[PDB]
């Protein structure tokens, strides 16, 4: 079995070489360069609308591409579609199993995908000839529970399941086309790139990975966290991404230089992070902590610049719209709130 | 108001949507929901097959008894980490727990020096002392008893428990096992553990579950009115 320990030492020496080459290309921290700019004073954001009607915890919320309609998922088995401007509801799609943990909105506004604990992704059609909403597709090829799913296109969808794997499917044929493996823990969050050619996924053991959908292999890996990964979001530019965690610490990684840049940690927070989202210009990094309120962490200064404390329970989802006009937050108190 | 013609028709649709949401919300809120837990071969299949049944991943079993609708969630096919998806079961009435008495001289697979009974005890300790299930009662079942007696009369109980002074017969041994299982409860002033020995007839098991659920409902109603 000398081949085994030989390969172990080979892998360890390769990792040491990678670490030394990674740290060698670093000359100055990002905080040192961004020391001659004026930070934002105070981001005072007040609530505008209060979307009510849910009767259980809220686990998923997504914005449409038209910045007007949103989709929400809850434990009572409903998939209500909200109109953000007039607070009216547009659909009340029911679900087969009332155990859901993710939801998505198609970029064309035709279909809506939803996962859950039954390791099955259901895709509903909203533009049928009749007046109801039918189940267009039902993808079932995962063993572990689904945690997140994103519409790469109107015909392709990429999901990240609980059995340490991700899958890129084809809706019309019903079978998966590509399978991304390599994580040793439960993949519980992924994010697609703005150009929708690469994506990132954070495992359950202090690790994130960058995959390409064409070749289907891992290009780079990022580490530095201690507890685990809980939420990831790309930078609007597409060359960096912010990664949350549970040990009251979020970080910013770069894709071109596979090394950590900044970390946004405070000694007054000992609670985990559930959702991480950027701004329209990539200057305000909204983070949702499970201590009954959110934060408006600055991106380039790592200094808190606002608190959206208008919530009653743990915030489970938050999302900025496409044009950056407002942000939506959904917590476990069955109340969505719009901030502008 | 200042709304247009077809804008007021959209507000009428939202009202009917909210009405249908509220009507369905008061129908699924008057039925009891309960979780089911246990080891691999703790007779969970035997329990779900024995009790009344009308109905990969989570499996839900719906039945009725004495004008009460019981839903039973069997999270047995979830091989993922239990820490991540457990907070989804925070709101639940009871947690059925299946334990096998005859599974105490049967050593685990893929190992030879760790006992299955101690594994079940550790799992019960992990479940009862969770930060989410700090207010929900626990119903505990001892499934196999005839095999347990036949094994304890041929093989002493000292194999699993190293400190035991009683005789090697079923009666005091069952009480000793029950006392050892009930002592693994740190929150001894907020939740109660209802222990039962599973029999061959359906009626006794269903009646015990119904009585436990009724007691939990009465306690919750007394806690609601600030009267207890």
């Amino acid at each position, epitope marked *: 079995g000398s081949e085994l320990d030989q390969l172990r030492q080979e892998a360890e020496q390769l990792k040491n070489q990678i670490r030394d080459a990674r740290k060698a290309c670093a000359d100055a921290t990002l905080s040192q360069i961004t020391n001659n700019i004026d930070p934002v004073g105070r981001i005072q954001m007040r609530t505008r609308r209060t979307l009510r009607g849910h009767l259980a915890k809220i686990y998923a919320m997504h914005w449409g591409t038209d910045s007007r*309609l949103l989709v929400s998922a809850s434990q009572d088995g409903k998939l209500i579609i909200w109109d953000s401007y007039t607070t009216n509801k547009v659909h009340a799609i029911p679900l087969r199993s009332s155990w859901v943990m993710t939801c998505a909105y198609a970029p064309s506004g035709n279909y809506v995908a939803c996962g859950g604990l039954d390791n099955i992704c259901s895709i509903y059609n909203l533009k049928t000839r*009749e007046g*109801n909403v039918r189940v267009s597709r039902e993808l079932a090829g995962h063993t572990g529970y689904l945690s997140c799913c994103r519409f790469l296109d109107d015909n392709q969808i990429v999901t990240s399941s609980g059995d340490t794997t991700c899958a890129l499917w084809d809706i019309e044929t019903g079978q998966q086309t590509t399978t991304f493996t390599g994580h040793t823990g439960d993949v519980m969050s992924l994010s697609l790139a703005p150009d929708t050619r690469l994506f990132v996924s954070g495992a359950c053991d202090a690790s994130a990975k960058l995959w390409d959908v064409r070749e289907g292999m891992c290009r780079q890996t990022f580490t530095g966290h201690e507890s685990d990964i809980n939420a990831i979001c790309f930078f609007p530019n597409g060359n960096a991404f912010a990664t949350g965690s549970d040990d009251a610490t979020c970080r910013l990684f770069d894709l071109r230089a596979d090394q950590e840049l900044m970390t946004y940690s405070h000694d007054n927070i000992i609670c985990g992070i559930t959702s991480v989202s950027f701004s329209k210009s990539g200057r305000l990094l909204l983070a949702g902590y499970d201590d009954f309120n959110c934060n408006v962490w600055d991106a380039l200064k790592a200094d808190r610049a606002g608190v959206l404390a208008g919530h009653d329970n743990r915030v489970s989802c938050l999302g900025v719209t496409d044009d950056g006009m407002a942000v939506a937050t959904g917590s476990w108190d069955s109340f969505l709130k719009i901030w502008n | 108001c*200042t709304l247009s*013609a077809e804008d007021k*028709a959209a507000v*009428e649709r939202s009202k009917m949507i909210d009405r249908n949401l509220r009507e369905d919300g008061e129908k699924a809120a008057r039925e009891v929901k309960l979780l089911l837990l246990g080891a691999g071969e703790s007779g969970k299949s035997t329990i779900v097959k024995q009790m009344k049944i009308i109905h990969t991943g989570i499996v839900e079993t719906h039945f009725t008894f004495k004008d009460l609708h019981f839903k039973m969630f069997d999270v047995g096919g979830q091989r993922s980490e239990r820490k991540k998806w457990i907070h989804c079961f925070e709101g639940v009435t009871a947690i059925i727990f299946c334990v096998a008495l005859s599974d105490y001289d049967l050593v685990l697979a893929e190992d030879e020096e760790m006992n299955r009974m101690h594994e079940s005890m550790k799992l019960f300790d992990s479940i009862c002392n969770n930060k989410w299930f700090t207010d929900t009662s626990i119903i505990l079942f001892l499934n196999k008893k005839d095999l347990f007696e036949e094994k304890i009369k041929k093989s002493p109980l000292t194999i699993c428990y190293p400190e035991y002074a009683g005789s090697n017969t079923y009666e005091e041994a069952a009480a000793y096992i029950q006392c050892q299982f009930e002592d693994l409860n740190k929150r001894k002033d907020t939740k109660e553990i209802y222990t039962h020995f599973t029999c061959a007839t359906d009626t006794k098991n269903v009646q015990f579950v119904f009585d436990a659920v009724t007691d939990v409902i009465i306690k919750n109603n007394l806690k609601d009115c600030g009267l207890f």
Partner: single-chain antibody
Amino acid sequence: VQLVESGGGLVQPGGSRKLSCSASGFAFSSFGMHWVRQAPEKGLEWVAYISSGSGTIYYADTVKGRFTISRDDPKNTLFLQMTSLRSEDTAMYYCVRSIYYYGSSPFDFWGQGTTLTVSSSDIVMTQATSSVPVTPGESVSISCRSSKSLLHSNGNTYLYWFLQRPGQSPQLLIYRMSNLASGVPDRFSGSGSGTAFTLTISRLEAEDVGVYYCMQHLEYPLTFGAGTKLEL
């Protein structure tokens, strides 16, 4: 999707029968219904409307308090009851479905209609020309003028266009002001300013010829136009 109507024939004044329309192919319980009259060799006009769930009902002031509308969801039927009819009610009747939500297209499926023969302020929409001779292969522009600004504070107008071929019921072309309906080819286009609107066709075929109607939906007293005949 199918809507078939019945209950028409020869009726003397003083009393009349009931018109029954049955639907099959969609969710009838979530669709509002409209009744549309169509006088012979004349223009078509609105009659009555009932909302989803029979919550809100509207009648035309010409037959206000004289006609009655009703639904039946268990059998998905619609009934129109007329107490007494004059000699001016002999016309064709259509039962149209429409659902109202953000992004919907009302007046999508008209139906077939039934005839009825009897033996013997509001916005004014005016069509530009009654009839236009056009040979195939020519871009044609039809204009419809209104008596008030249909543009609302929200940002969208409420002027719909319908095309009626000889021998069958009309169909929707472009809902609201310019968005194209489903199933209609991309040759049709629409535009406007707020008072006078236009509909343009790039190339005209032998299958696209008939009468064009413009309708306003700003207020519940809906009204149509006189009609622009398109000839070969």
